[PDB]
Amino acid sequence: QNKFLIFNEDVYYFDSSSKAVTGWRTIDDHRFYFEPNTGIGANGYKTLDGKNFYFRNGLPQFGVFKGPDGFEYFAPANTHNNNEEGQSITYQNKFLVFLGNRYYFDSSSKAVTGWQTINGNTYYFMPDTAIAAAGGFFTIDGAIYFFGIDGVKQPGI
Amino acid sequence: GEDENRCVRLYGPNFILQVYSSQRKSWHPVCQDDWNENYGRAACRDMGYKNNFYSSQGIVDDSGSTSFMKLNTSAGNVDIYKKLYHSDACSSKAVVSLRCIACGVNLNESALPGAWPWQVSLHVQNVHVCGGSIITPEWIVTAAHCVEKPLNNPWHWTAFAGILRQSFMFYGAGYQVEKVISHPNYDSKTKNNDIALMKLQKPLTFNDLVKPVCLPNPGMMLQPEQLCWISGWGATEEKGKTSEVLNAAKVLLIETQRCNSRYVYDNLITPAMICAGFLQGNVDSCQGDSGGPLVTSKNNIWWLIGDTSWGSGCAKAYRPGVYGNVMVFTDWIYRQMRADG
């Protein structure tokens, strides 16, 4: 009663009735989501009631994670317009810095990828992570490019 | 006169206690005569260690300087540093050495239990994000970019110590962080002064698997290319993730005049930053080892050199990693511990 359950990498939770819980449940002031069909902890991008998250073992994550349309700034609670904890939020035409990761979002609130030019500064964003290369020589498209730790490219001719 | 005429500092790899002399503008040692454990405890408490006291004893003077802040007895129940006064030379022929905390001792590929007892893993939303380094029972060193802007509440973080397997870091079993302190100078772009203090809500219990790592004392004389070690959960394989196991990799320091060259970083590295790669590559830090400890062994004690900042290939050397200079921030660390007391 009233504890979690790890079983073959699956995660569950049982309430005071010894029954596995499904849907949103507030455990220790945190919200988890469990699949209605199987009850396992949620995993991966999961649109829900018009609010998009990115679950890992049933706990919404913070940061940038690819979805059906691309990457999104899944942000902490009350970061923009009373958004829930980890809900995807509108983030257009401005940079995002996160654990030393510098993301850039376009007008549609999706993180750009590959080469970009912003305010006269040329950037590059790793396609598989959208992380903006920064801080030393990088091997891109079979060449060499040097980016300052702000991420801005260095011409170097 | 609290930001000068009351400042004490341990010195060297031998922990030689010193007191600042405003009259001559110098750091001086203290003669061993008249000295006992009580004044050692006072000097430790002043240095922000609160109740941590390990050992004090006299050691034959080796620095060679001829001057001492001699203690008084008949001054009355006054400030300890109201008494220490100058003298040409004492008759005890011994200067004081004072250790405020037992640290820098570990048990004698993956790392075995109790080999890096000072390593911790920080969990933002049940996922390993940054490492750390124990310095006292209730203080952990890490990076400022780990706890910046969006992620800055102490309620987001949680720490795990003495556990080697990421799979074994359960939910609700870590230590809750009751405060997050980033360096005021920290610049989000250049990441200069990238160091943060994360005070736990409850003290860490120290055992064979959990132990502090000593801070760098002034006057250590780092050789041009040391033999350090780097620990943390990452991925030796590139295109990887948080490793299931804690690893450790021998690394070699790199001179800042070489690491700022134009084949390496072209002046990206500031005075508060340190490089430690490994020739032939095949070993360096990696993701999840950001905010982890870089340590060395000198004079039989494990010292903390820095913490991870950033890199450009991470085991693709000729673009090695970078760590913040713990020695340069040690005074701010002491001040933050002191004020919290």
Residue numbers in the entry:
A (entry chain A): 2460 to 2616
B (entry chain B): 142 to 249, 260 to 492
According to the publication:
To acquire accurate information regarding the TcsH-TMPRSS2 binding interface, we managed to recruit smaller CROPs fragments for the cryo-EM study. MBP-fused TcsH2236-2618 was selected as a substitutive TcsH fragment to form a complex with TMPRSS2ECD for the cryo-EM study. We then determined the cryo-EM structure of the TcsH2236-2618-TMPRSS2ECD complex, resulting in a density map of intermediate resolution. To represent a more detailed interface, we masked out the marginal parts of the EM-map, and the local resolution of the TcsH-TMPRSS2 interface (residues 2460-2616 for TcsH and residues 142-492 for TMPRSS2) was further improved to 3.0 Å. This structure exactly shows that the SPD of TMPRSS2 binds to the CROP unit-VI of TcsH. In the TcsH-TMPRSS2ECD complex, LA, LB, LE, L2, and L3 from TMPRSS2 together hold the CROP unit-VI of TcsH, like a big hand grabbing a guinea pig from the top-view. Interactive networks are observed predominantly through hydrophobic interactions and a few hydrogen bonds with a buried interface at about 1130 Å2. L2558 from SR27 and F2605/I2608 from SR29, together with V280 from LA, L302 from LB, L419 from L3, and W461 from L2 contribute to extensive hydrophobic interactions. In addition, the backbone amino groups of G2559 from SR27 and F2596 from SR29 form two hydrogen bonds with E299 from LB and S463 from L2 of TMPRSS2, respectively. The proteolytic activity of TMPRSS2 was achieved by the catalytic triad composed of S441-H296-D34543. Based on the structure of TcsH-TMPRSS2ECD complex, the TcsH CROP unit-VI largely covered the flattop surface of TMPRSS2SPD, with the β-hairpin of SR27 and the loop of SR29 stretching into the catalytic pocket.
